[PDB]
Amino acid sequence: RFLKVKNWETDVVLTDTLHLKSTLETGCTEHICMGSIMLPVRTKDQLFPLAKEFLDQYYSSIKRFGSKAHMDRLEEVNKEIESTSTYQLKDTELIYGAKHAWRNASRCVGRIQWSKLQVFDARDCTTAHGMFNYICNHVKYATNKGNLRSAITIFPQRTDGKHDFRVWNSQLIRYAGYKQPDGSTLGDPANVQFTEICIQQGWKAPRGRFDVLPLLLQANGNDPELFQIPPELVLEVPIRHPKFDWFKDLGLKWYGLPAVSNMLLEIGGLEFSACPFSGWYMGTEIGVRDYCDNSRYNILEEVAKKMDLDMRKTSSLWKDQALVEINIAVLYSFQSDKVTIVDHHSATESFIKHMENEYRCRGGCPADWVWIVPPMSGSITPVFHQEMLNYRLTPSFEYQPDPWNTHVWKG
Amino acid sequence: RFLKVKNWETDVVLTDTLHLKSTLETGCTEHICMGSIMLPTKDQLFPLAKEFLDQYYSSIKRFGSKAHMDRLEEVNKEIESTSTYQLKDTELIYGAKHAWRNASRCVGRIQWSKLQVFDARDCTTAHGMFNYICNHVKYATNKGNLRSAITIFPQRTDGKHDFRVWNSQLIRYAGYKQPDGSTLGDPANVQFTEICIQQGWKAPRGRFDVLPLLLQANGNDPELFQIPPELVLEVPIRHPKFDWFKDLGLKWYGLPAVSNMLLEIGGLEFSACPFSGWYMGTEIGVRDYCDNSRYNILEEVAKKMDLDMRKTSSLWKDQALVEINIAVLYSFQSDKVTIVDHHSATESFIKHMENEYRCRGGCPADWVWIVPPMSGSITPVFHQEMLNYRLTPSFEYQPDPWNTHVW
Ligand code: HEM
Ligand code: HEM
Ligand SMILES: CN(C)c1ccc(CCNCc2ccc3ccc(N)nc3c2)cc1
Ligand SMILES: CN(C)c1ccc(CCNCc2ccc3ccc(N)nc3c2)cc1
Ligand SMILES: C[C@H](O)[C@H](O)[C@H]1CNc2nc(N)[nH]c(=O)c2N1
Ligand SMILES: C[C@H](O)[C@H](O)[C@H]1CNc2nc(N)[nH]c(=O)c2N1
Ligand SMILES: [Zn+2]
Numbered sequence A: 001r002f003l004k005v006k007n008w009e010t011d012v013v014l015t016d017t018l019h020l021k022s023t024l025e026t027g028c029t030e031h032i033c034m035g036s037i038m039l040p041v042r043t044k045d046q047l048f049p050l051a052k053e054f055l056d057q058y059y060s061s062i063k064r065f066g067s068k069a070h071m072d073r074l075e076e077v078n079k080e081i082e083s084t085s086t087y088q089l090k091d092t093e094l095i096y097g098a099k100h101a102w103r104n105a106s107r108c109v110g111r112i113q114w115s116k117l118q119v120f121d122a123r124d125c126t127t128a129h130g131m132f133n134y135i136c137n138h139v140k141y142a143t144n145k146g147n148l149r150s151a152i153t154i155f156p157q158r159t160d161g162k163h164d165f166r167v168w169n170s171q172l173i174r175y176a177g178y179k180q181p182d183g184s185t186l187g188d189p190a191n192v193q194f195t196e197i198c199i200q201q202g203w204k205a206p207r208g209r210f211d212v213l214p215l216l217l218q219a220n221g222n223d224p225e226l227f228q229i230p231p232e233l234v235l236e237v238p239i240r241h242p243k244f245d246w247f248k249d250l251g252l253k254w255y256g257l258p259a260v261s262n263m264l265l266e267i268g269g270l271e272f273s274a275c276p277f278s279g280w281y282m283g284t285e286i287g288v289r290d291y292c293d294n295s296r297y298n299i300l301e302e303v304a305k306k307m308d309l310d311m312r313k314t315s316s317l318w319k320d321q322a323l324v325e326i327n328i329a330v331l332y333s334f335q336s337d338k339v340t341i342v343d344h345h346s347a348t349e350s351f352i353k354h355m356e357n358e359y360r361c362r363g364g365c366p367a368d369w370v371w372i373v374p375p376m377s378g379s380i381t382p383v384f385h386q387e388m389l390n391y392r393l394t395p396s397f398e399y400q401p402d403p404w405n406t407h408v409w410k411g
Numbered sequence B: 001r002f003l004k005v006k007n008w009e010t011d012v013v014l015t016d017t018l019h020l021k022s023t024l025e026t027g028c029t030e031h032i033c034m035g036s037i038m039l040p041t042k043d044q045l046f047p048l049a050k051e052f053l054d055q056y057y058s059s060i061k062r063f064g065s066k067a068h069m070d071r072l073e074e075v076n077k078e079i080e081s082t083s084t085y086q087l088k089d090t091e092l093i094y095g096a097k098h099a100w101r102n103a104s105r106c107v108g109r110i111q112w113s114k115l116q117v118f119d120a121r122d123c124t125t126a127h128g129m130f131n132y133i134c135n136h137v138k139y140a141t142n143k144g145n146l147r148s149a150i151t152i153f154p155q156r157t158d159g160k161h162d163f164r165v166w167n168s169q170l171i172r173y174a175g176y177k178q179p180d181g182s183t184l185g186d187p188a189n190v191q192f193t194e195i196c197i198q199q200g201w202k203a204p205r206g207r208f209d210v211l212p213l214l215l216q217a218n219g220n221d222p223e224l225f226q227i228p229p230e231l232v233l234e235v236p237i238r239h240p241k242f243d244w245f246k247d248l249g250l251k252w253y254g255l256p257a258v259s260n261m262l263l264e265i266g267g268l269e270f271s272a273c274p275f276s277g278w279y280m281g282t283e284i285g286v287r288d289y290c291d292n293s294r295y296n297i298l299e300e301v302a303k304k305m306d307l308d309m310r311k312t313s314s315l316w317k318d319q320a321l322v323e324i325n326i327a328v329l330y331s332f333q334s335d336k337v338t339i340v341d342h343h344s345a346t347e348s349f350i351k352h353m354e355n356e357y358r359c360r361g362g363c364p365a366d367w368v369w370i371v372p373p374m375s376g377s378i379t380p381v382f383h384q385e386m387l388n389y390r391l392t393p394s395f396e397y398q399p400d401p402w403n404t405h406v407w
Helices: A044-061 A067-085 A091-103 A128-146 A191-202 A245-250 A283-292 A300-306 A318-336 A344-362 B044-057 B067-081 B089-101 B126-144 B188-200 B242-246 B279-291 B298-304 B314-332 B342-360
Strands: A003-006 A013-016 A118-121 A151-154 A177-179 A185-187 A216-217 A225-227 A236-238 A253-255 A263-268 A271-273 A397-398 B003-006 B012-017 B114-117 B147-151 B175-177 B183-185 B213-216 B223-225 B234-236 B250-254 B263-267 B268-270 B394-396
Touching: A013 A271, A044 A067, A044 A091, A091 A263, A091 A397, A118 A128, A128 A151, A128 A225, A177 A191, A185 A191, A191 A216, A236 A318, A245 A300, A245 B175, A283 A318, A318 B314, A344 B114, B003 B213, B012 B342, B044 B067, B044 B089, B089 B114, B089 B147, B089 B263, B089 B394, B114 B126, B126 B147, B126 B188, B126 B213, B126 B223, B175 B188, B183 B188, B188 B213, B234 B314, B242 B298, B279 B314, B298 B314
Parallel strands: A118 A151, B114 B147
Antiparallel strands: A003 A013, A177 A185, A216 A225, A236 A253, A263 A271, A263 A397, B003 B012, B175 B183, B213 B223, B234 B250, B263 B268, B263 B394
């Protein structure tokens, strides 16, 4: 079956055959679309077909499908599964797998970069101190003094579900949030629960507006342990505006490295519950969501006051005016400090080219419009006008529950 | 089977039961979501009539009454006899209002119950249609104090006697392709404009030429009529800060009046059912003015603002976009023509959603369309999970008449 998608601005029509390779469910049915819903122990039974599907993919990609090396690998994996109930990926397969999980991430606008990903194999790691060391190295490598490089660090896979490696932080670098007795929040409201956990675990909070959170690291199903990332490895950018000199006085800064550390990487039926990865920021992540979300730093008003906008009526679009200048400031600040960042115009323009390339060479490109379209200036980006098909391919990154909700405490 | 939607900004959770009454299909499957795709007999008829009459009589607290059963058998008799049936005025009004209520792509639905329904089922000719349309236009425009309305022409019979308005909106600007290669006026309306011209329209070949109506009655060939200019309320666009803005020569019309959709009620099809409300500012400022395939004036405005258009990272497009939308809202408000900004409208819609979940068990909503085309995440709807499903009565798309018309 062939599915077509149209760009209504260019009239470019693309044909998707790749969706036929999709096995996982979407959440939607013929009777309901759940496109805007945020989030809608394994036996050898189901494991070998998942292994086999993956190895077929891997061997095709290297143009060795049906080769003796291919057949021997399947044989080897089958025996390892049936005798040990799981299996180990080769380094090559792991790298391929991690790149392809990124390639298949339908919510990622940055996928033009998918083939350039530094894979750090941390499957020999056994302790939290070991994890801390690997994470420091990842951060140093990825930061590269401002010339950001995409990377992922992969810790040992799940076994019985009782010995999971987990990074309890949602991102490797993130600011603390503190609920005040008066109901207000100091720092990042998104991180209040996690901050409370760290504090309970013994973290001494400075209690400021931009305190880099400690790492809370779980190796092999043991209770998680606290580590402070060397401050010298945490690159931060003071936010100023190229025209508004009062902007610096808002006291804003942000960190340079976005490094998501709470997702699950699935490759060939194997589950990597700790696989922190990092690229670089699109400006709106910080300027629109992090700064201007009502449930985050929420600085729109303070900014709009300082610009002396008419704030009596929303129809002045004071919020829209303030939002733009803030986003200008984020981009200006990162560029001036030579920290990698991309604006949403560049990023979405590159995504369209990527997506067209993928349709040609791959027969498709799963894309979640709801997430690909930037949170400001939507229709003046080309992706707004692009029809997209969302489906699930493996390897993939998946959500997993927060570890404090499932962890069995050892004491 | 009972579905929850969450608002991630306010933590409000609503439970949807209304989707279970859904009948039509979405285009999506368990294996693929098509949420971003723009367009994904007597025996057929009586269950449809029945489903509709059931909800009608339930809405007036007479479910399972004598009058309900009576109406049900009367319509039943009429279907067996005539192969169709006719809605009572009360049923027609209920159906039209609910078609709007059910329009998952409409952010303005808090107004759904305040709709003026004009019954034009007695209409037989294009001149008749013209008259009804002028009346609609005058009524809805109301000297700038806009009122929602729909005019309903006779229903489809055998598909050979369709009433159709060929225009996509009652009021729209012409588009002409130049020898210069570019496009004068509205590029969206190039094809329709040509059809007017080959049907006899004498175009002024200007930038903002109000198109003439092309009206088809009873499956006959369509005819041209000029809407009396005096009924077409237009707004010169100026900026409350930039004096040069007026020099751009921009204007827009006050009345958004969609005329090409199909209204389905109780299995009956109304192929000509133009309706109108009032504008949300971004439709004009963001889409009409800034879309590349529309009037595409961003560059010109940016230049007038003297912005650094060297690099995209200066966000000059975003700066210009905001000012354009400021001008639009400012101009309409200054001339006392009803308009709503995207902040006010989405905030209203959140309240409507909660009303509908509370009083009806749900509200079908298409996030891709409900989230405005600028400043998305600073409006509440961005953080609102929505379930999209198809309820009837409904407004549907239908093919452009010129591809279907046996001339
Ligand atoms: C290199 C530059 C990159 C850019 C500019 C970029 C951009 C983005 C953005 C803006 C989002 C939306 C995030 C949000 O709104 O929360 C996203 C999502 C995502 N990205 Fe990328 N990304 C990059 C690299 C990567 C890498 C290296 C990976 C993995 C190896 C990745 C995997 C993902 C995944 C799995 C999501 C979905 C997250 C979720 O569902 O919560 N991205 N990306
Ligand atoms: C009264 C003020 C109203 C406002 C502010 C409003 C707002 C909107 C907006 C912004 C859209 C998106 C349209 C687009 O982007 O092309 C829309 C779509 C729609 N509206 Fe409303 N509307 C109003 C009145 C009405 C009325 C009176 C009806 C019918 C009786 C209606 C039925 C629809 C339908 C069926 C759609 C989907 C159009 C499509 O699928 O192409 N609206 N509305
Ligand atoms: C629970 N809530 C409110 C919630 C949780 C996660 C999300 C999405 C987090 N996605 C973050 C994410 C993931 C991968 C990325 C890759 C690159 C980049 N620049 N940013 C990236 C950002 C949204 C809401
Ligand atoms: C096929 N293409 C290019 C295409 C067709 C229809 C559309 C959407 C047309 N619907 C416009 C529309 C419909 C109903 C409305 C009701 C009120 C209002 N203010 N605007 C309204 C605007 C977009 C693109
Ligand atoms: C409810 C809605 O799905 C939710 O707010 C989504 C919308 N689109 C998004 N898009 C991106 N990139 N990131 C997000 O967090 C969200 N949030
Ligand atoms: C491809 C995509 O579905 C298309 O551009 C949609 C996106 N959202 C929209 N939303 C509204 N309100 N109106 C539109 O025309 C569109 N266009
Ligand atoms: Zn869907």
